[PDB]
Structure formats: C-alpha cells, structure tokens
Design a protein around this ligand. Structure first.
Ligand SMILES: N[C@@H](CCCC[NH3+])C(=O)O
Ligand SMILES: N[C@@H](CCCC[NH3+])C(=O)O
Ligand SMILES: N[C@@H](CCCC[NH3+])C(=O)O
Ligand SMILES: [Mn+2]
Ligand SMILES: [Mn+2]
Ligand SMILES: [Mn+2]
Ligand SMILES: [Mn+2]
Ligand SMILES: [Mn+2]
Ligand SMILES: [Mn+2]
Lengths: 333, 333, 333
C-alpha cells in the first residue's frame, strides 16, 4: 500500500549562492514544522541524516573570479555535498529528501546523485533557468548557475579554474526538463533552445494545463519510467502569494495545487530518488509570510513522499464492539 | 425570470462544536454586510427569521463522554435546531439560508430538513469529511462529527447515549456527495470508501475541473433533479487566501470562482432547499482577513439565491424621452 | 524578431472621474518602476511623450448636471485628450502605451484614436461595464460612463449638453468586446444585450477557459485581424489578491496569468495600436499592496509590447573563446 516505506532527510544550509542572509535557516524551518509528525502518520519511516556543513570561506580567501562571487566556497562546498549524497545514495527504494539552502547546492547534490546513479534524469521546477554560464551572469550569484557546471554540452562556455576540476559534468541536455519558467535571461534561452533542453514555461502551463505539462516533461526525459528521478524544486516556482519568503519572487507562478500535482505524479512513478527543496528564506517577509511559505513547503514535501489528498486507509481498522461498547445500532434491540 | 422570488434567513451561532471562540459571531458578520441590500436589489424578498439560541451547558453539566467535548450541549442543541428548521421548512419554492456557527449545527439542520423532506440529498462542500465517529476522533470536537450521527450505515460505530435517542439517522450514504476534500482522517477515508459515499477531493478538482466535478456530484445523488438539495458549505472549503478567518484552514482549497460555480449550478437546479454556511469566525485573523472572509461569504450566499455574474435585467427599463429630457440624438435634428 | 520595435508612453493623471484621491499618481507609479529598463532590455525603443494635463475645474465652475459629477471637467478633458492622442497616432507599427488615471480618460483616448483610425475595435478588460448612461448612474461618477458617450446606438439615452457637442460617438456596438465582467449594473446588462455587444464575463472565463474567451472576443470584433486594436485594461479586471490598490475592487477576478494571456494574444495579432491601463491608485492599501499592484501592472504592460514568458534570444551571442579565455572543454586537451 506504500510506494516508499522509508526515506532519508538531509539539511543543506547553503547561503553563499546569493546575497540575502537567511537561506541557511531553511532546514530548521522544516524541522520545526510538523513535517516529521505528518510523514510518520502516513506510515513512512523518516530518518534524519543531519545537516551538511557548507564551506564558507572568509572574504579574503574567496575573491571574485570571472565575476563569480564566492566561487571557491562553491567548489569546495559542491565536492563536500557530492560525497555525502553519494554515500547516502549507495547506502522498493529509499528517497532522499533534501532541504536547502539556496539553489547553488544542486551542483553538488546532482553530482553526488549521478555518482550513484549515472543514468538519472532531472526535473527542474523553477521560475528561473539557473543555467547562466559565468561570463553571462549579470549578478555573479552562484545560485543562478548550478546547472551550467553539470551539463556536458555547455563545457566550452565554462572558464577553466583548477579548483573546479573535480566538478565533472554528469548530465546530458537530453536528461533535464524544466517546469514553471517565467524569468529566463536571454543567454539561458539561447542555450536551452540550442541544445534542445525540454522546457515548459508558465505560458505552456497556461495553454496546455499542468496535467499535460507533467506528462510531456516525464515523456521527454523518462519515457518508460526506466530512470531514477532527481526532482529539484525551487520554492520560488510557486506563486509569491503562497511562497512569499524567498529571495527572487516572480509573480504569476504555479499555484500550490499545480505544485502538488507535479510532486504527486513524480512520486507515483516509483522512481523518485532525490527531491530537494531550495530557496526557503525565513528571514524574508512577515511572520505570516514565513508561515505561508513553511506550510507550502511542508505540503509539497509530503506529496513527494506519497501523501494522497484523496485520503489514506488506517493501518488497523477500529471497531466499536471490539472495545466492548454498546453501539446505537446494538442498543436498538 | 426568477427561480426563487423569496427566501428565509436564519442565524445559528454555535460555538461548542470547536474550541476557538468567535464562530458565534458568524450570523452578525453577514447581517452587518450588504448581503440583504444586494439580495433585495436582485428582486428577491428575504425574510430574517432571527437566530436559534444554542444550548450551552456549564462545564460541570457537560463532562466528556467517550472523548466527546460538550456532547450534551450538542444533543440538546441539535434537537432544538431540528424543530425550528422543520417548522420553517413545513411553513417555485422558498430556500432557507442558514449562517453558522461551527459545523456541528449540521446534525440539527439536516435532521430538521429531512423531517420535512425525507428524500433530500446532501452536497457537502468542505476541506474535511466531518464524519469522524466518536471513538475515532483525535480531538473530540463535535464540528468534526456531525455527519456520523446522520448516516444510517454508520450506526454500529456510534456509542449509545440516552440523550442521543431523539437524533435518528436520516441519511443513506447514497444521498451524500462531498466536494473540496483535502484533509481526511484515515478512518473517515475508510468509512467513505466502505459505504460508497460519492466524494470529489481537490485532486479530482485538479484533474477533472470543477465543471465536471459539479456535474458528477449532482448525477451521483440527484440524477434527475427529483430531490430537494441540502447544501452544506464550510467556508474552509475555500482557499485560505480568500477565506482566512476560519478555525481549521487548509492550503490548496477552492478558488472563490470554483466556489461560485458550485453554488451557481446548485441554485439553477431549482432544487436548492437549504443552504448553510459554516465556520465563519470573525475573531480570527486581521481586520483585512475578516473583510476578505465576509466578502467571500456574501458572494457565495448571493450565488446560492440565484445572483448571476453575467448580469441581471432591470425590472423597469428607464427611458430618457419619458422623463421629458432631450437626448443628443433628438437634439441632432 | 520583434513585432514592435518602438513604442510611445503617455501619462494621463485623471482623478475627476471618481471620488478617491490618488489615481493621478498612476503614471508616476509606472515611471518609478523598472518598466522602461525592462522594455529596453527586450530591445524595444520606448519614447516618453510626457503627461496630458487634465482640466480640473473648481467646484463652483462644475456643478452637477443630470446627476453627473464634474461633467464639465470631463468634456473639456476628453477633448484635450483626444487632440493629443490623435496627434500621436497620426505621427510594422508604433503602439501607444497609456497609463491612467481613472477610466473616464477612455472617452478621450478612443475618440482621439478613432480620429486617426476610424475602423478600430475595442477590447475592454474590466470587472465593470463602464457604460452607464447619465440618467441611470447611481453614483454620477464619470469613470462608470466613458463608453456610453462613444457608442452610436446609445445616443438617444445621452442627455444633450452643449459642451458635449464635440464628443461625437465613434463606435458601433459591433466594434466592442468585454472580458472579465462580474459587476454589471442592471441597465448596463440591458443595453449590452439589446445592442448585441460581445461580452465575456467571469462566468464565461470559468466555463470556457481564457484561451477560448480571448479567441472568441477577437473573432467577434476583429475576425481577420484587419482592424487596429484599442485595448482598454482596467487594473480592477484582475483579482484584488494581485491588484489590491484600485478604487472598486471586485473579488473573483482574472488571475495575473489570465491577464497576461489576454495581453500576449492581443500583442501577437500585430494590430495592437493603443493600450491603456486605468485605475491604478497608489494611495489605496498598504505599501505591500501598492508594490503588488505596481508589479501586476508592469508585467501586464510588458506583455502588451511583446514580452515572452518563454524567453528572448540575445541580440549578440556571447562566446568564451572570443574573449580569449580557456574553457573547461579546451583545457581538457
Ligand atoms: N537568472 C538570475 C536569477 C537567478 C535566481 C536564482 N533563484 C541569475 O542568474 O542570477
Ligand atoms: N477531521 C478533524 C478536523 C475537523 C475540522 C472541522 N472544521 C476532526 O474530526 O476534528
Ligand atoms: N458601475 C458603477 C461602478 C463603476 C466603477 C468603475 N471602475 C458605476 O457606474 O459607477
Ligand atoms: Mn528560482
Ligand atoms: Mn533556482
Ligand atoms: Mn472544514
Ligand atoms: Mn466542516
Ligand atoms: Mn472597473
Ligand atoms: Mn473601468
């Protein structure tokens, strides 16, 4: 009755991928919620595997290189993430749930994931492409670049740096699909189209509906459910009305319900191997904003592990006459 | 031109069905709005039939029995509600509009309604099943149980209590349909499926669309429009973004528009006999929250009585030349 | 690659069409945003043509006539708007973008537009019909009447006034289509139906979906894309959740996404000649409300000029090896 009976939980408090302080509190925002209690109530055994400790260099140790900010913190953090994720993945099936942390963590989680499962596919749920190459990034923020280091067809656009040697590109462009895009930089658009990356923007969601979008995205990168799935979910893919506490909010996003449909369908493939939830920042917005964002996150992560909005059956059906209590029906004799 | 030319309005300020103070102000929240003025402007004669006075026992008079809180207040209130509702229903057709009050009132309104119209059907619009049997309720809150006392197929799960004798089960499981469910307890799911109660969750709304959901719900319990309809609308069926002032908000609800489509279609059957609106609590949230919730409620109740978003025709068409005023067209001679 | 490579921007700070102070700050709310910067980044040359200065008579100069408030301010303002708009339109094609200002400005913008392009059609995006004739207006507010002075079939319902002589009716009822209606006065409904004006209410959007609604609206008034389009967009057509800072908010409106689809499809006809955005009032609501409303407006206006949510291609593709930088791919030799 359960597709996944156990799962692992991992925190990654990255905050050097972007300038707003507070994404490091992401994992704690979910640990303080009722997420663990709710997942236990659906009968899933969830093991907390702790937090990964990011490498945060002093400013003097990590100057800008090719416009990138904190790039040495990034390379070192990426290798440390990959090792731990690889270990957990090599250690039905047991999904790994990861809570960020800004989205720069994805270079490491996927690198590590791909080590254990080289044939995986990636579903990237995001308002943004996160695939700027360093010389094209207007900001230099690493959370806007994590896919460009992973995609093989892009490596003539990545500047060589010796500390990036261990970050080997493990994805073909044919293995990635986007859902929810609405704020692409022109150079991301060029690369996505040039190398044929499957992508479904909010325009596509409006015109096709999310059911057909989810279907087409799975067909494009996992046509027969043969591949492990890495689901990389930026909370800002969701409309700011339901996920306001995030650093780069873009209006006109996914409703919570559309976000749940994505997670529900991906969960039910049986192939969900890693889900990561990025860009929660509880230091942004009002207290009510933070509670809305926390709530949307918890509902999203529960859907990934298999929670069904149509309800769950009890493990043991309770009966009145078994407790030696007279029912109304019984009394009417 | 009017399906219903008159209607009755009844307040039921129940607040012992759940622990948060303030549902007793529900009827006043609607009486203070412009609802009466707006319904008059569409040409409907609305008669205010006052409030029912709930029986609220002192704590010492009403101890917990089988985990239920305030169960004697509930049985006594239920019988008092049923008598008044039966009277009003026996007294086209004239819909009764009821404003709660927490949802525990429904055991009484339906009991009373069914006395006058034993063949009725129930459309239950709610995030929740409200059909916990007493021994399965985690909370003991009566607003989470009103249907379990009414449904015939469940009576071997209701503990006998002498003061509950006059609460006779008047519904078959085949007469109830749910729309909007997204937070079912496992034992409700068991009972709903075991006894074949028609139900459409937010998953079904996402996959089928609300038009097909409404259609299938009416087909399931009122296939040829032969039966009177009791529409029991929990305001928390609506998304918290539009109805925040309610005690058990659940994210990912019905949009206001989907809520209006339900009410518009039910109204246009000609069979709307009672509509009740439960769980308004103006003591929850900010002032703006309360105004949003009040507004959503007023729009919902107007749709039930037949308000059309596509507009209404005037009772008397006004003409300029009849007031002896020269028009631009006339002057151009 | 660009349907429109240049455009004009015009402010019209009307505020005598309705009693709430603050619509005069509408144009500044958009000038302070990043709208100009964003439109430049998509490669469009946008020329700011300044503001039109409304005629705001002293109260003693402009008494009520036929219940109308500030009607002489209105007639004088309308003629001044029309002259400037006619001039700009006579001066691919170059869309005029107009930011209000309350919606009473539309009598002048369309009058002026029609002078330059007498065969145009009008797409009116609004919660309201804005077509009350003076003797039927409950309020006397001119922003609720701008279409009644323009529509030829209505001129026996317009009271003659000598200062209104230069406001000649330039629209046939067959040239106008509404989208988003949900708060029609009974006499507007009568006139819209009597004279066969195409209209799509929120009921129609719910039942048909916005894609079919947009399609049917264009078919009704511009079946072969032969006519110039005047797009008159009241910000209150959008749901109050995304455009709260406006004077007559009505719940259950267009989502931002549905609003974008309207603008995207109208833009892509190639026939968008004027778009006006009315009823922004930054003196209403909280600071956050104002920022939400500003944001929704900016996204709407960018879609009108051709912004694509699916992304834009760079004007010059950047290449790493052209900057004399060794790529990772290159280094791996
Ligand atoms: N595309 C921008 C924004 C990325 C935002 C990531 N959440 C960049 O590369 O920096
Ligand atoms: N299912 C829960 C919540 C009910 C909430 C009713 N509005 C219960 O039985 O108490
Ligand atoms: N229909 C009303 C409201 C118009 C509101 C315009 N934004 C009137 O004529 O005054
Ligand atoms: Mn993002
Ligand atoms: Mn991202
Ligand atoms: Mn409920
Ligand atoms: Mn309820
Ligand atoms: Mn309007
Ligand atoms: Mn308007």
């Amino acid at each position: 009755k359960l597709l996944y009976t156990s799962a692992n939980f991992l925190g990654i408090p990255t905050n050097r991928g972007q300038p707003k302080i507070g994404t490091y509190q992401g994992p704690e925002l979910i640990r303080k919620s009722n997420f663990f209690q709710l997942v236990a109530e659906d009968g899933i055994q969830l093991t907390d595997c702790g937090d990964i400790i990011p490498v945060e260099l002093n400013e003097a140790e990590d100057p800008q290189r090719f416009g990138m900010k904190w790039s040495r913190s990034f390379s070192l953090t990426t290798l440390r993430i990959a090792e731990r994720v690889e270990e957990l993945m090599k250690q039905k099936s047991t999904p790994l749930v990861i809570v960020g942390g800004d989205h720069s963590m994805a270079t490491g989680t996927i690198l590590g994931h791909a080590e254990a499962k080289p044939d995986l596919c990636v579903l990237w749920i995001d308002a943004h492409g996160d695939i700027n190459t360093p010389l094209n990034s207007a900001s230099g923020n690493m959370h806007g670049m994590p896919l460009s280091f992973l995609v093989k067809e892009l490596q003539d656009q990545i500047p060589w740096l010796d500390d990036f040697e261990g970050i080997k590109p493990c994805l073909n462009a044919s293995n990635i699909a986007y859902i929810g895009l609405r704020d692409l930089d022109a150079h991301e658009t060029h690369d996505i189209r040039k190398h044929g990356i499957a992508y479904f923007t909010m325009l596509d969601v409006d015109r096709m509906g999310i059911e057909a979008v989810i279907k087409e995205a799975l067909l494009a990168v996992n046509p027969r459910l043969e591949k492990a799935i890495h689901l990389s979910f930026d909370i800002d893919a969701l409309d700011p009305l339901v996920a306001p506490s995030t650093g780069t909010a873009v209006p006109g996003g996914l409703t919570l319900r559309e976000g749940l449909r994505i997670c529900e369908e991906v969960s039910a493939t049986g192939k969900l191997s890693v889900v990561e939830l990025a860009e929660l920042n509880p230091l942004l917005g009002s207290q009510e904003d933070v509670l809305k964002t926390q709530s949307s996150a918890v509902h999203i992560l529960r859907a990934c592990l298999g929670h069904c909005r149509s309800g769950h059956l009890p493990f043991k059906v309770r009966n009145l006459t078994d407790q030696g209590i007279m029912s109304r029906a019984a009394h009417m004799q």
